[PDB]
């Protein structure tokens, strides 16, 4: 009777001591969700059931999640990832002609569905526009207008950043493709979350510094908005 209560309290204190240790690790780790649209090269990005990976840069722990065990058009499980730091979206920008409703429009529809979600209403998205080299190759080779009629009246932005030795056609193509996502991102945003688009290729090696900087910007903007300074 009297000894039973003492034994119960001894085990509870030991358990609570360990729970304090695990709280430090949980609060210092950043969770990321990786998404893709079919054949998009997202496996190459992570190369260099559910699958989890661990990596660390500048003594900061990141932990990425890739879902491949569930394949459906209704993502009922997506409400679990409402506390992640950011979402990584990988799309192949060079698949406008491929129909196997072409792939680019389906990716745009998926992005629109994800952005306007009741649970993911405060989560930012890091956008990777993969496969740039072969996109430029097929653009140089002898038409986006045959699939995207709005391209017939597009002009390259004045405040653009063309790469060195770049034909002004491929730059217009990339900026058109990026603005397609950017207009959806800015159409229904109230400052609670933003989008960070990047142009990516296979030979890129600085894809982790980009994620680090984008997460830093996300957290800093969150704090600035919280303290009524933004």
């Amino acid at each position: 009777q009297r000894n039973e209560e003492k034994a119960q309290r001894e085990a509870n204190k030991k358990i609570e001591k360990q729970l304090q240790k695990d709280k430090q690790v949980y609060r210092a780790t950043h969770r990321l969700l990786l998404l893709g649209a079919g054949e998009s090269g997202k496996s190459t990005i992570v190369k260099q059931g559910i699958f989890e990976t661990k990596f660390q840069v500048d003594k900061v722990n990141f932990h990425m999640f890739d879902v491949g065990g569930q394949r459906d058009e209704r993502r009922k499980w997506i409400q679990c990832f409402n506390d992640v730091t950011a979402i990584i979206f990988v799309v192949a920008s060079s698949s406008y002609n491929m129909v196997i409703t072409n792939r680019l429009q389906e990716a745009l529809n998926l992005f629109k569905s994800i952005w306007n979600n009741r649970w993911l209403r405060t989560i930012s998205v890091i956008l990777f526009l993969n496969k740039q080299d072969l996109l430029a190759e097929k653009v140089l080779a002898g038409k986006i207008e045959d699939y995207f009629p709005e391209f017939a009246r597009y002009t390259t932005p004045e405040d653009a950043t063309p790469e060195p030795g770049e034909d002004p056609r491929v730059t217009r193509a990339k900026y058109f493709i990026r603005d397609e996502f950017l207009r959806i991102s800015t159409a229904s945003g109230d400052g609670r979350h933003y989008c960070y688009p990047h142009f990516t290729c296979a030979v890129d090696t600085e894809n982790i510094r980009r994620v680090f900087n984008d997460c830093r910007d996300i957290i800093q903007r969150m704090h600035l908005r919280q303290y009524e300074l933004l």
């Binding site: 360990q18 729970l19 695990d22 949980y26 559910i50 879902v67 065990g69 569930q70 499980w77």
Partner: protein, 331 residues
């Protein structure tokens, strides 16, 4: 050809059960005196989880219960003295369900890894891992000490043999993801609610569907039998709860209000079946009168949405969990 006969068969079923509706449930129960106002107050508050809570299950002794959370823990509480008994760390941090054995010697778990894990409490280490589902697990209940039934997101349910780790039988027939299940008091039949706005009645011994109920219009999130065993209640994300009768093969009453527009996460009955407790996405729970479809009480002491709910076997307390990493006991 084949599709033509399907429409004819579905037509007579509607006509067969249309002639059986002699009167409504509410018409019979107009003379019953109302239950009146019901007020409940929080007795205990359990703290220690680092993240939101998705699952909860009471014990057969009505003293201990288990809970699951996204941080990767499986904590067993002591509701009387508020003392943690066990803390099982999980290999996978994504957990969607948990169960407590009737004997009290084992606890099950599962989630986004498509695996069900059984733990040994009286030895704590993993005792068995069940594999074969191609979708995320949604629920699991213990039939006995050696067999267990599970539902997953691949539109199928299975009955497992824990000793050998092999599926004894598989239940097919749904089109969308299966979200919940519940066992009968005699452990011979069970019901399942899926995302195609339908509920089915299965036979554990035989392995084939008996009846189908399609009164809803949205994803069904929860399901629970009447204590008698001849009726059950469902809850969808269109702010409606419905009562279905097995022997009448049709629904009897609906529970809805014009001031409620959120979804429903969980449902449960009381000891006598007079009350129906349902959790909502609007941060609080509601208490209904089963035979009248009118509200009788509100439990509004949670900061974020309620995800789970349960009632003790003796019917002495009600436990609710939410996404603010808190558990509360209402008496």
């Amino acid at each position: 050809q084949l599709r033509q006969e399907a429409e004819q068969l579905k037509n007579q079923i509607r006509d067969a059960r249309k002639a059986c509706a002699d009167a409504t449930l509410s018409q019979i129960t107009n003379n019953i005196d109302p239950v009146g106002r019901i007020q409940m107050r929080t007795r205990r508050t359990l703290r220690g989880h680092l993240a939101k809570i998705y699952a909860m299950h009471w014990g057969t002794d009505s003293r201990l219960l288990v809970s699951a959370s996204q941080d990767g823990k499986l904590i067993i509480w002591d509701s009387y003295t508020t003392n943690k008994v066990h803390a099982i760390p999980l290999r996978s941090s994504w957990v969607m369900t948990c169960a407590y054995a009737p004997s009290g010697n084992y606890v099950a778990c599962g989630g986004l890894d498509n695996i069900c894990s059984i733990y040994n409490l009286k030895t704590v280490r993993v005792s068995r891992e069940l594999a074969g589902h191609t979708g995320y697990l949604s629920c699991c209940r213990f039939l006995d000490d050696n067999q267990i039934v599970t539902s997953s997101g691949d539109t199928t349910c299975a009955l497992w043999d824990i000793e050998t780790g092999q599926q004894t039988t598989t239940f097919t027939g749904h089109t969308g993801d299966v979200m919940s299940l519940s066992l009968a008091p005699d452990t011979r039949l069970f019901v399942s609610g899926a995302c195609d706005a339908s509920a089915k009645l299965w036979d554990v011994r035989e392995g084939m569907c008996r009846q189908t109920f399609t009164g809803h219009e949205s994803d069904i999130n929860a399901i629970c039998f009447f204590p008698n065993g001849n009726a059950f209640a469902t809850g969808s994300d269109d702010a409606t709860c419905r009562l279905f009768d097995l022997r009448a093969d049709q629904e009897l009453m609906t529970y809805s209000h014009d001031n409620i527009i959120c979804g429903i996460t969980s449902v449960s009955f009381s000891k006598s079946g007079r009350l129906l407790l349902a959790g909502y996405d609007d941060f609080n729970c509601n208490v209904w009168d089963a035979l009248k479809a009118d509200r009788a009480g509100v439990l509004a002491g949670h900061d974020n949405r309620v995800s789970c709910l349960g009632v003790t076997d003796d019917g002495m307390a009600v436990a609710t969990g939410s996404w603010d990493s808190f558990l509360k006991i209402w008496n």
